[PDB]
Amino acid sequence: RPTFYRQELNKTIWEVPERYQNLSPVGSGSVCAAFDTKTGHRVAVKKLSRPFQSIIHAKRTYRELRLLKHMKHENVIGLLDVFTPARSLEEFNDVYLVTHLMGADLNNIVKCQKLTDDHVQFLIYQILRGLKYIHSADIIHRDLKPSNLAVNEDCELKILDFGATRWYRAPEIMLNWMHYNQTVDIWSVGCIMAELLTGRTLFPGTDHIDQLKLILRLVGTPGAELLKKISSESARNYIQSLAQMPKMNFANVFIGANPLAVDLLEKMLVLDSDKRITAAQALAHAYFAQYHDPDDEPVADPYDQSFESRDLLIDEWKSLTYDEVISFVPPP
Numbered sequence: 001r002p003t004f005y006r007q008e009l010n011k012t013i014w015e016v017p018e019r020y021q022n023l024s025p026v027g028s029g030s031v032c033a034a035f036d037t038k039t040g041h042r043v044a045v046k047k048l049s050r051p052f053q054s055i056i057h058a059k060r061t062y063r064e065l066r067l068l069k070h071m072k073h074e075n076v077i078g079l080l081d082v083f084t085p086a087r088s089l090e091e092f093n094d095v096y097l098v099t100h101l102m103g104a105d106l107n108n109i110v111k112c113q114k115l116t117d118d119h120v121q122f123l124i125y126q127i128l129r130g131l132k133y134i135h136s137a138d139i140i141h142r143d144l145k146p147s148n149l150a151v152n153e154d155c156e157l158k159i160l161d162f163g164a165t166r167w168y169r170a171p172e173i174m175l176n177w178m179h180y181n182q183t184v185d186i187w188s189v190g191c192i193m194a195e196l197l198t199g200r201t202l203f204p205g206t207d208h209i210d211q212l213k214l215i216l217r218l219v220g221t222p223g224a225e226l227l228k229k230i231s232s233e234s235a236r237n238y239i240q241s242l243a244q245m246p247k248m249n250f251a252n253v254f255i256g257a258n259p260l261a262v263d264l265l266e267k268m269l270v271l272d273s274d275k276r277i278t279a280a281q282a283l284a285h286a287y288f289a290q291y292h293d294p295d296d297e298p299v300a301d302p303y304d305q306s307f308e309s310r311d312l313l314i315d316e317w318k319s320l321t322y323d324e325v326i327s328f329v330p331p332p
């Protein structure tokens with residue numbers, strides 16, 4: 001190809017097809033609202049910051065682009081376009097990603113509306129539906145939180161990742177277990193759910209040690225079956241040096257809530273990750289009877305992440321990223 005145009009926005013320089021107009025900053029690496037003229041819809045444009053500065057940077061640009069190109073589901077961000085001003089590989093230095101503009105995050109909705117039980121079902125249902133799709137590609141989100149969830153005026157929701165976070169984090173990620181099953185995202189969904197029922201942060205941790213403290217008051221210190229699975233002797237004693245706590249009865253904590261929502265929370269917010277309900281299982285739970293449709297909860301196409309285990313040169317990553325730009329076929 002098209003013809004590009006240059007525009008300086010808050011000291012940053014944006015070169016984009018003319019297709020997109022009325023570029024407006026949305027804060028922070030830098031995203032702009034824009035008007036797409038080919039369709040007359042509002043978009044969000046992201047300029048990748050310092051994309052190829054290190055090997056690790058370069059691999060991450062490639063990672064994000066491969067990921068976004070693969071995600072094709074109603075409850076997950078999808079790529080509308082990706083472009084570079086560069087006419088060639090030599091010239092390649094910037095990447096821009098295009099997605100549908102949603103002008104509210106779940107945070108902002110929870111500020112000034114107390115959601116009805118029925119809202120909580122539809123919202124959480126959409127998180128699990130997107131999550132079933134992401135998990136079926138063998139991807140873990142790892143940083144699920146209201147500010148990564150986009151919501152429109154029909155309260156339709158999509159999952160994304162802009163790139164305290166700590167409030168929705170699985171206890172295992174914060175003790176650096178390094179394994180991590182997919183249910184770390186289920187833990188996060190539990191924290192989101194409670195805050196939608198309640199209006200308040202389930203675990204408003206002051207810091208990393210305060211975070212863990214609050215989690216254990218609710219869920220309890222590890223029971224005997226859990227300790228049996230803990231391989232490291234230091235970790236075992238570290239767990240034995242924390243004030244020991246009984247599991248609370250959730251019925252007693254979430255006082256006036258749908259008893260089916262309570263029973264769901266009990267299935268998500270379990271210390272032992274092997275015992276958390278999965279996304280697929282939770283879609284089928286009685287709380288979502290009004291929304292559940294087993295024929296409309298699709299899974300992902302095989303996702304090849306063999307790249308995650310390669311150590312390559314900046315310009316290799318760079319060139320792989322370039323192939324991916326060129327081969328983009330936009331959605332209908």
Ligand SMILES: CC(C)(C)c1cc(C(=O)N2CCS(=O)(=O)CC2)c(NC(=O)Nc2ccc3ccccc3c2)s1
Binds near residue numbers: 097
């Ligand atoms: C798990 C899942 C939800 C599917 C995502 C992973 C990543 C990701 O790239 N990774 C790899 C990089 S990182 O390691 O920093 C995090 C995980 C997303 N990336 C993403 O959501 N990117 C965005 C965000 C806002 C946009 C605004 C306008 C236009 C374009 C936009 C694209 S979404």
Ligand SMILES: CCCCCCCCO[C@@H]1O[C@H](CO)[C@@H](O)[C@H](O)[C@H]1O
Binds near residue numbers: 175179271272
């Ligand atoms: C005191 C707080 C400690 C947190 C207990 C974390 C238990 C999480 O669960 C553990 O997850 C691992 C994968 O991450 C699995 O290999 C283990 O089998 C599983 O029990």
